[PDB]
């Protein structure tokens, strides 16, 4: 029937965000480290300054959106529940809103890469990224492909 998509988010409360995608969410009464699946919110691992690709803004938007939302819900797909980091791989939702979409659609988070298991929302994820890429919002506003050489 395809009536029960069972794709309803659910968690409890967000303690605090670490790096946009990595946030400590209190689920079932326990504060576990959650990670936005199929998304990337900042990856400052070069030590340039903190604005090479809206890395500082990525966490800020997700941090303020979660701490301000008051209600956070997570959705675990078929992908691995722990990306070899004992974390909680899944999509983040604030007050019934899509964080991943808002981030990518706004230009704060890009599209991650799941080996297998997590590829259900890969349709909307790629769409939001493409729109931000072609339009060059923020994250995709400094990724000159340089067609040539």
Swiss-Prot record:
Cofactor note: Binds 1 Ca(2+) ion per subunit.
Primary subcellular site in the record, as a coarse category: secreted
GO MF term set: endonuclease activity, active with either ribo- or deoxyribonucleic acids and producing 3'-phosphomonoesters; metal ion binding; nucleic acid binding
Catalytic activities: Endonucleolytic cleavage to nucleoside 3'-phosphates and 3'-phosphooligonucleotide end-products
GO cellular component, one term: extracellular region
Keywords: Calcium, Endonuclease, Hydrolase, Metal-binding, Nuclease, Secreted, Signal, Zymogen
Needed co-factor(s): Ca(2+)
Domain of life: Bacteria
Enzyme Commission no: 3.1.31.1
Active site per the UniProt annotation: 35, 43, 87
Chain positions recorded as Ca(2+) binding sites: 21, 40-41
Subcellular localization: Secreted
Family to which this protein belongs: Belongs to the thermonuclease family.
Functional note: Enzyme that catalyzes the hydrolysis of both DNA and RNA at the 5' position of the phosphodiester bond.
Annotated protein name in UniProt: Thermonuclease
Chain's gene name: nuc
């Amino acid at each position: 029937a395809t009536s029960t998509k069972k794709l309803h988010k659910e968690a409890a409360t967000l303690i605090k965000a670490i790096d946009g995608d990595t946030v400590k969410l209190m689920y079932k009464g326990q504060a576990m480290t959650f990670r936005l699946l199929l998304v990337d919110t900042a990856e400052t691992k070069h030590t340039k300054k903190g604005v090479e690709k809206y890395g500082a803004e990525a966490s800020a938007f997700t941090k303020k959106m979660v701490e301000n939302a008051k209600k956070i819900e997570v959705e675990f797909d078929k992908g691995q529940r722990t990306d070899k980091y004992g974390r909680g791989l899944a999509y983040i939702y604030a007050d019934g809103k899509m964080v991943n979409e808002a981030l990518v659609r706004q230009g704060l988070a890009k599209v991650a890469y799941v080996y297998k298991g997590n590829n259900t929302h890969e349709q909307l994820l790629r769409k939001s990224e493409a729109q931000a890429k072609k339009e060059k919002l923020n994250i995709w506003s400094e990724d000159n492909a340089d067609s040539g050489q």
